[PDB]
Amino acid sequence: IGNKFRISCGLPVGAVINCADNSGAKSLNMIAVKNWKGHLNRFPKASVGDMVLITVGRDGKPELRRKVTPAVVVRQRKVWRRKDGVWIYFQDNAGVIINPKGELKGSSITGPVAKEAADRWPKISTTAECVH
């Protein structure tokens, strides 16, 4: 929802990110990023607040595994500058399984969530315990 401001995209394709929701997915492999035009040789890149197509790891519930699913990045270890000059980073790269319509597969989100993801996706902000 809404125009975003370019931030530093720290997660290239192949990044395995932790899963913050209670979807029974332990890790989310990153197949690709939504709204990515490409340049020759450039791996798709994703930042906080971005829909990426993920695949649940072997550790995940089998029902969720073997399916390409949309997810929103809510944490990133790469430091990024908000237009207010604030440079922020998370301890771990994370994601929540969301449908393009914003609906969350998991009821709750365990851990801190970034402001960018909370503002872009209303359902993330409502379920977030904290929005740092």
């Binding site: 430091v79 604030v86 440079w87 922020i88 980073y89 998370f90 301890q91 771990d92 851990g111 801190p112 315990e129 904290c130 740092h132």
Partner: peptide, 10 residues
Amino acid sequence: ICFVRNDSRV
């Protein structure tokens, strides 16, 4: 720089 850990502290 600010870092937010899983402890939820900035």
